[PDB]
Amino acid sequence: DPNLFVALYDFVASGDNTLSITKGEKLRVLGYNHNGEWCEAQTKNGQGWVPSNYITPVN
Incomplete structure (x- = not known):
């Protein structure tokens, strides 16, 4: 997915x-x-807002 990120x-x-x-x-x-x-x-647990600096793209 082009919008794949990791925590x-x-x-x-x-x-x-x-x-x-x-x-x-x-x-x-x-x-x-x-x-x-x-x-x-x-995520597998649902949908919602997370801090942008806690995740990063890995596509």
């Missing part, structure tokens, strides 16, 4: 619109928020 660090969901992720997990990114600080991502 660099664990992230515990904060807001209801965020998604917990674990270091090493693969994600598909749907997009970014207005300032690029958050990414909307899909």
Whole structure:
């Protein structure tokens, strides 16, 4: 997938619109928020926003 990313660090969901992720997990990114600080991502656990600096593309 062109939008494949990997989690660099664990992230515990904060807001209801965020998604917990674990270091090493693969994600598909749907997009970014207005300032690029958050990414909307899909994992095997669901969908939600994660910090953009906690993930990086690996396509």
